[model samples]
Target chain A: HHHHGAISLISALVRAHVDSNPAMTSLDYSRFQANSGDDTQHIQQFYDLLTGSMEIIRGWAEKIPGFADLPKADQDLLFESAFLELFVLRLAYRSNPVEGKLIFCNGVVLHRLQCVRGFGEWIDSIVEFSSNLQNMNIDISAFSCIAALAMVTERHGLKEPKRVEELQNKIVNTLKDHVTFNNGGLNRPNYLSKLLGKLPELRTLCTQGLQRIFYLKLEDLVPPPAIIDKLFLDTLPF
Target chain B: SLISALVRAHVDSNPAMTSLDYSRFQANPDYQMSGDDTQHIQQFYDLLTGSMEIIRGWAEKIPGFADLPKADQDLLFESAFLELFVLRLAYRSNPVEGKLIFCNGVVLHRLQCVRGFGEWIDSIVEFSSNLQNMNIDISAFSCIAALAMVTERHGLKEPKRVEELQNKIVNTLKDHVTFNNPNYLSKLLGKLPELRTLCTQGLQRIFYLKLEDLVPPPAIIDKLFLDTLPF
Candidate 1:
C-alpha cells in the first residue's frame, strides 16, 4: 500500500515545497527591479535575491523526507556543495525565458538587462538553460523531485553519503515512477534521460556563476554578503 | 623547493574528520537472506563512491592544485583517482589484522571485502601489508598521496607546471625519507608502480562487476572506467 503510493506521496511533498515559497505569499514575482547607475544597488539587489534563495533552498532541503536525518556536517556539506546548482535549477524552472525575465525565489523579478552587470554573461546562460528546461514541459512533481535530487545527490567529503544515497534512491525511484505513469510510459521513452541530462547543464551554469562571483569579488565592486561569500569560497573547486 | 610549505599543506589536508567504523555495521552474508551478491556489491560500490568523494577533497587541498588549468586539473585527478584510492586505502588499512579502512573509514575485514572486491581484495591486502611494513609516517604518506595525482599526464594542458608541482612533492617526499633512519626511497618509489598495477586491478574488478550485470556502476565509477581507457 505504502509502496504503491510513493509517487503521490512525493508528489504531494513537492507540491507543498512549491506552494510554500515565500514569494508565493508575496503574490508571485510582483517585486521587479531595474538597473541604474553605480552598479552597487543592482548588485546588492541581486545578492539579496541569491541570499534569500539560499535560505529557501536550505528550508526546502530540510523538508525532504530524510534530509534532516543526516548528520549536521553532512547536511551542511550537501547544501553547500549543491547550493549553486540548486539555485540555478530552481531559477530556471520558475523564470520566463521567452520574456527574458529572471525570477528569484523571493518574488523578485528583473529584466535580463538588470541582471547583466551583476550576473555578467552568466545570466544569459541561465536564460538559455531556462528555455531548454521549459521546452521539456516538465510538470511540478517531476521538477520538485529533480530539485530535491540535485540537493540530495552524492557530494564530496560527505560524512554519511550512504545515508544520503539511500534517501536519493528513494527520491529517484519516486521521480521515475512519477514520470513514467504521469507522462505515459510508451509515449516519451527518452523523457527521463532528457530530464536528467539538464543536470550537467545546471553544473556548467553553476561554474559560470562561481566564476562570476569570483570576478565581482576581485573587482571589489560590491562587498559580497557573508552568506554569499561563504558560498563562493566553499563552492570553489580548489 | 618548498618543503616547508608542502608540510603545511599536509597539515591542512588531514582535517579533524572521523572515520566510519565498519565493525559496527552489520553484514548479512549467510546470516540473512538480505546478504548476497547483490547486497555486498551494493555495499562495495557505496564504499567506492564515498571514497571517491574524500579523495577529491584531499586532492583539492594540495597546495597549488588550484593553479592548474581546469582540464589539466580534471585530467590529473581523474586519471590518478584510482591510484589515490588504492594508496589511501592501503595507508589507512591494518593489514596485519586483515582489516581495510576504506577512504570513508569503512573498516571491513579482508574476508568481508572479498565478495565484492573479488580477487583484487587479496592483492590490496598484500599491498597494505608491505606499505605498512615500510613504516612510512603520515607526512611522507601525504606527499605520496599528492604525487599520485600531481604527476604529468598525457593530456595535460601544461605538463611543465604539473611537473614543477610534482617535482616539489617529490623533493618533499625525498627529504622526508632522507632524514629518516634508513634509506627506503627506492622502496617508496617502487610503490608507485605497484599502485599503478593495483589501480589496474581495481579497474579490472569494476569491469568484471559491470559484466556481471547485478547492478550498474555509479556515474563517477563509470566515468572512472571510461576515462581510464586509452580511447
Candidate 2:
C-alpha cells in the first residue's frame, strides 16, 4: 500500500545519490586555498555550498510523498539536521576512489589531497569513510534509503517527532524490502545488514564533519553567512 | 623477525593488497546452475580455508596464546579472526586495483568471485580499503594485526593475562607510532573498536548467508561463523 509508492520514491532518492553527478576529474584543494592565503575565502566558499546552495536536498524532501505535510518548522528541523547527513552520504556515493577523487554536490571533483587542508587530522577519517562507502558497492535504492534514514532521525526539539517517526518507519520498511529484493535472494540477508551497518559509519562521519567545521569556527578565519548562522549554527548545540 | 618470520610466510608472500587482486564468479549461484558455478564456489571455499589456516597459525603462536584455557582461547580467537582477516588482507592487498587477494596470488575483483560470501565480501573490501587509508606502516600494521588476534575480548579465562598481553602490544604500538609518526598514535588506537565491530558485522553476513542455505559453507567458514557468535 504505502510501500508500493515507496519503491519509486526510494528509486528517486537512489538515482539522486548516484546519477545526478556531472562528469568530473580531480582538482587541487590547494587551488581553493583551504586554510591558507585567503583561507577565509576557501572556508566561506566550502560552508556556503554546504549551507546555502542545497536546493536538491529540499527537492528530495518535497518528493517524499508525505514529507511536506509536516509542520513547516518540523520540516526545517528535519531538513537542517538531515542536510549534513544527506550531504555526506551523497558525497560518499559519488566518490570515485578508483580514480582517487570525491565529488561535491555542485559536481566539483576534489583530489584526495585537496580535501586535506583545514580538515587537519579529521581528513584521514574522511578518507577512510569514503573508501568504506565505495567498497560496499551499495545500490542506489539502498543508498537512498540510508540517505533518508539519516534525515528521518529524532531531534530534541521536533514538534512532531511521532509523525516524523511514522513516516520514517514506512520508508524504513520499504527500504528493507527493496534491499532484500534488490540483491539476489541469497545475498539479501547479508546485503541488508551490510547496508544497515553503514549507519554508524555515517553517523561518525557527520559527527567528525561537524567538529571540523566547528574547529574552523573557533579559528575564526571566516564568519558563517547570515542564513547559516541563524538556521544551522545557532540551532546546533555547538 | 619474531612477527614476520611466522606471519610473513603467508602475509608477505601473498599479493594481498599492495591490496589489489580481483576475482569473479561465472554467475550468481542458483540451484539449477550448480555446474561450473559450484566449482568456483568450491574454489572460493578452498581459498578461504587456506587463508584462515595461515592466520590461525600466526595467532596461536602469540607468546602466551596457548596458555589460555580452551574456552578462553576459542572466545578470543573468535573475536579476533574477522578483524585480523580484514587488517592483514588490507595491509597486504593493493587498494589501487580494487581487488581482494585471498591467497598469496589468488585474487578476485570487488564484484567477482564472492558468491556465498554475499554482502560480507563487500564489508571486508570496505574494511580493507578504510584500514589501508589510515596510512599505517607495515611494522605498525603487523602489530595491529597481532593486537587484533590478542585484544581483550570479553569472557577470557584469563582476562588479566589477555589485558597484560594486550597492553604489551599497545606499548609496542605506541612506541612504533611515536618513532614512525608520533601523531597517528590516537588514531591508530581509535581504530580498534571499528576493527572489533567488523567481526560481529561479519557474523551477521555469515549467519544470514547460512540461513539462506544457497550453498553449504565450507567447514572452515562454518566453524568460524559459529565460533564468532557472542551469544
**How do the residues A1-238 of candidate 1 rate in per-residue lDDT, one tens digit apiece?**
1246576659666865776464644535454554356789868876887888777788887888778889999999889989889888888887889988777777777788878877888888899999999998988888888888788887767898898898788877777777766755543549888887887778767877765665566456787888877775554331
Model 1 stretches with alpha carbons more than 4 Å out: A1-5, A22-35, A184-187, B1-231
Candidate 2 has a DockQ of 0.01
Best by DockQ: 1
DockQ of 1: 0.02
Candidate 2 regions with alpha-carbon error over 4 angstroms: A1-4, A15-38, A231-238, B1-231
Residue-level lDDT of model 2, residues B129-164, one tens digit each, is: 777788877667767777777765656677888888
Q: Please state the error at residue A119 of candidate 2 in Å.
A: 3.3
Least accurate 10 contiguous residues by lDDT in model 1 chain A: A22-31
What's the lDDT for residue B33 in model 1? Answer: 26
State residue A202's C-alpha deviation in candidate 2, in Å. 1.4
TM-score for chain A in each prediction? 0.90, 0.82
Per residue, candidate 2 scores C-alpha lDDT tens digits across A23-53 of: 4563333343222335666576567667633
